Amino acid sequence: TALVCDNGSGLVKAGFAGDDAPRAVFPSIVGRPRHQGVMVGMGQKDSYVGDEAQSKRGILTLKYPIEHGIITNWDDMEKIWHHTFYNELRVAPEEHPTLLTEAPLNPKANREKMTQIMFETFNVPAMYVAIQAVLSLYASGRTTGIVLDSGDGVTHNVPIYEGYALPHAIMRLDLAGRDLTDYLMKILTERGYSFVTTAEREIVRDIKEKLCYVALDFENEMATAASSSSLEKSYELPDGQVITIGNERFRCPETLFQPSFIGMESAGIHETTYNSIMKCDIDIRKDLYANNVMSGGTTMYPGIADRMQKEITALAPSTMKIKIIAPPERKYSVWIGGSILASLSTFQQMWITKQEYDEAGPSIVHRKCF
């Protein structure tokens, strides 16, 4: 059986090929205790991962081994991969060919180190690295469209037409769910609340996951919030005290449409999606506007597809029909696409094998994958 691992910046999602959803979905996190631990002999250990590290977040310090879709700590990454195979999937990796996911426009050394760890340390039969946008198109069941994926660390656009990607029209924005968590954690200070610890980052992420939404007209939501309490909602901290959140609840996600809120110069997700369509050839643009496929957890806000349709309708010429394709399974449409691709009968000659990694070395991944 083949494994599929969607190696996300904020969540790991993992499973077998042909399963309709991941078997495992957990924080892409490693942690160490920050206190004396003087009551020894209750089963303590030097480091923790995933849901265990998340459940003890008060006494831990939490680190993500991935930053902006780049592995920043390779020891912590192999500790997470060991935990995927032995703790979560509960299988031997040397019996399972493994599909992996990556963002486009990544460092070449990231894909190579991800390759040599798989063959040298997990002894895998065969491996493949897929650009995570085309997997979102496989889950959508279509040959053509512009994929927008926004995960934890990165947002990116990939135009595909009739199975061909346009790699010059591909573009990435280093702004997604982590940066929106940092900005929510900043603007809650305007109401007098404080969040600074790595546990408090996760409390603000756990708020962002459920209170926040995208405004359909930001100045109107600001003006109505400046004249009524009806947009305010409330949440309880693990410590038991209660907080109330108002225009902060849409000013956070608005950063995707106004990146200048976090001091970035770059274009918003509507403007970058339109500019990626305009960077494509004149005949394909009609079928890209008809197929804006949304993907990844930062695309899960209420109202974001309606806002995206409003905005791309203002940028495009008025004669033609624009639609946003935003399934309920948005968070998993990458992994679901990997499940489909790893199950295709024609894909079984595309796996990069140990028996060709042997003579070529780690540079095999660049010549064989993409």
Partner 1 sequence: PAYHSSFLSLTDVPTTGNIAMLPLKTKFRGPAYPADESQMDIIDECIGLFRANCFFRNFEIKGPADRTLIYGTLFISECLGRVNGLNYRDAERQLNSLALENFSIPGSGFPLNALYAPPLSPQDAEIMRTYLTQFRQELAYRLLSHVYATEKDHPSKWWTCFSKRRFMNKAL
Ligand X SMILES: Nc1ncnc2c1ncn2[C@@H]1O[C@H](COP(=O)(O)OP(=O)(O)O)[C@@H](O)[C@H]1O
User: Which one, 13 or 83, has the nearer CB to Mg ion?
Assistant: 13
147 and 138 in contact (C-beta within 8 Å)? no
| Least gap, CB of 225 to ligand X (angstroms) | 19
DSSP string, 69-120: TEES-HHHHHHHHHHIIIIII-S-GGGS-EEEEE-SS--HHHHHHHHHHHHH
57 binds ligand X (CB under 6 A): no
- Residue 345 is a binding residue for partner 1 (CB under 8 A): yes
Residue 238: CB partners within 8 Å, gap ≥ 6? 58, 203
Q: Which token pair is 146? A: 């512009």
User: Residue 316 — φ and ψ, nearest 5°?
Assistant: -75, 160
Name the minimum Å distance from CB 163 to ligand X: 24
Is 84 or 311 the residue whose CB approaches its own copies more closely? Answer: 311
Shortest distance, CB of residue 265 to partner 1, whole angstroms?
25
- Are 27 and 52 a contacting pair, CB within 8 Å? no
Piece of the chain touching its own copies by CB under 8 A; list 117-125, 137-145, 303-311, 328-336: 137-145
Residue 47 interacting partner from Mg ion, its own copies, partner 1, none (CB closer than 5 to 8 Å by kind) = none
Question: What is the nearest approach in angstroms of its own copies to the Cβ of residue 289?
Answer: 8
User: If contact means CB under 5 to 8 A according to the sort of partner, which of ligand X, Mg ion, its own copies, none does residue 58 touch?
Assistant: its own copies
Fill in the amino acid letter for 282.
Answer: I
Near partner 1 by CB under 8 A: residue from 227, 349, 355, 359: 349
Task: Indicate the helix (H) or strand (E) that contains 132.
Answer: helix 132-140
Q: Is 151 in the site for ligand X (CB under 6 A)?
A: yes
User: If binding is defined by CB under 8 A, does position 284 make contact with its own copies?
Assistant: yes
Which residue in the set 109, 223, 314, 360 belongs to the binding site for its own copies (CB under 8 A)? Answer: 109
CA dist 83 to 20, 31, 55, 78, 363, Å? 22, 13, 16, 8, 26
Restricted to residues 22-61, the positions that interact with its own copies (CB under 8 A) are: 33-44, 56-59, 61
Binding to its own copies by residue 239, rule CB under 8 A?
yes
Q: Who's near 49: CB < 8 A, 6+ residues apart?
A: 29, 30, 31, 79, 80, 83
Q: Which is nearer to partner 1, 78 or 287 (CB)?
A: 78
Q: Give the nearest distance from C-beta 310 to its own copies in angstroms.
A: 17
Residues 327-346 that bind its own copies (CB under 8 A): 341, 344, 346
Chain centre to alpha carbon of residue 246: 26
From the list ligand X, partner 1, Mg ion, none, partner contacted by residue 194 (C-beta under 5 to 8 A by kind): none
In three state form, how does the secondary structure of 175-226 look?
A: CCHHHHHHHHHHHHHHHCCCCCCHHHHHHHHHHHCCCCCCCCCHHHHHHHHC
**What does the binding site for partner 1 look like in residue numbers (CB under 8 A)?**
41, 345-346, 349
